């Protein structure tokens, strides 16, 4: 357990995600949308810490922060390990889906789904559109098919 700092840890985790991605120069180009969007979710999250509770965080709240932590580490963990051209080529070749944050985008919805419900029920604010569905990954596949053509140039040498 490590409250207080954890609050900011979440934001930073989601922020760097966008930096690490943009820093990369691979198929992640299309996935960049994820790292850029993830920032919109943490944006309002700050409102919670801003309140300045100055005490132990709510169980329900922490429960979402503890699980959400994976959404970040995982998101960046993908591109991080796939940073190596040889490491990314292995996946694309050993996988049909040309997406990095394929599952990351799905799981994220599961976590955000709760966080949002708590924000709309407590903060009573118009939380981002979390109720999307499988369509979320659908669009990712559409572009993933295109990028596949670009990755080709990387194959040869």
Q: What is the distance between the alpha carbons of residues 131 and 143, in angstroms, rounded to a whole number?
A: 21
Report d(CA 36, CA 4) in Å as an integer.
25
Distance from C-alpha of 6 to C-alpha of 12, rounded to nearest angstrom = 10
Tell me which H or E stretch contains 129: none
Closest CA to 5 of 47, 63, 65: 65
Q: How was this structure determined?
A: NMR
Residue 95 is given by DSSP the state -
**Three-class DSSP category at 57:** coil
Q: Give the C-alpha separation, 26 to 85, whole Å.
A: 8
Alpha-carbon separation of residue 94 from 90, 101, 121, 132, 153 (angstroms): 6, 16, 44, 29, 17
Q: 3-class DSSP state for residue 25?
A: coil
Asked if 73 contacts 13 with a C-beta cutoff of 8 angstroms, the reply is yes
Location of structure tokens 């292995």: 90
Token reading at 61: 């709240």
Other residues' Cβ atoms within 10 Å of the Cβ of residue 101: 27
Q: In 3D, which of 59, 45, 50 has the Cα closest to residue 3?
A: 59
Tokens of 131: 């109720």
Neighbouring residues of 87: CB distance < 8 A, sequence distance ≥ 6: 81
């Amino acid at each position: 357990g490590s409250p207080g700092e954890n609050l900011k840890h979440i934001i930073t985790l989601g922020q760097v995600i966008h930096k690490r991605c943009e820093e990369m120069k691979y198929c992640k180009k299309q996935c960049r949308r994820l790292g850029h969007r993830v920032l919109g979710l943490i944006k309002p999250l700050e409102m919670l810490q801003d309140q300045g509770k100055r005490s132990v965080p709510s169980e329900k709240l922490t429960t979402a922060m503890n699980r959400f932590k994976a959404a970040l580490e995982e998101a960046n963990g993908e591109i991080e390990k796939f940073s190596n051209r040889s490491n990314i080529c292995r996946f694309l070749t050993a996988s049909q889906d040309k997406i990095l944050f394929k599952d990351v985008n799905r799981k994220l919805s599961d976590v955000w789904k709760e966080l949002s419900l708590l924000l709309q029920v407590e903060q009573r604010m118009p939380v981002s559109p979390i109720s999307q569905g499988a369509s979320w990954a659908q669009e990712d596949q559409q572009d993933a098919d295109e990028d596949r053509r670009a990755f080709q140039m990387l194959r040869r040498d």
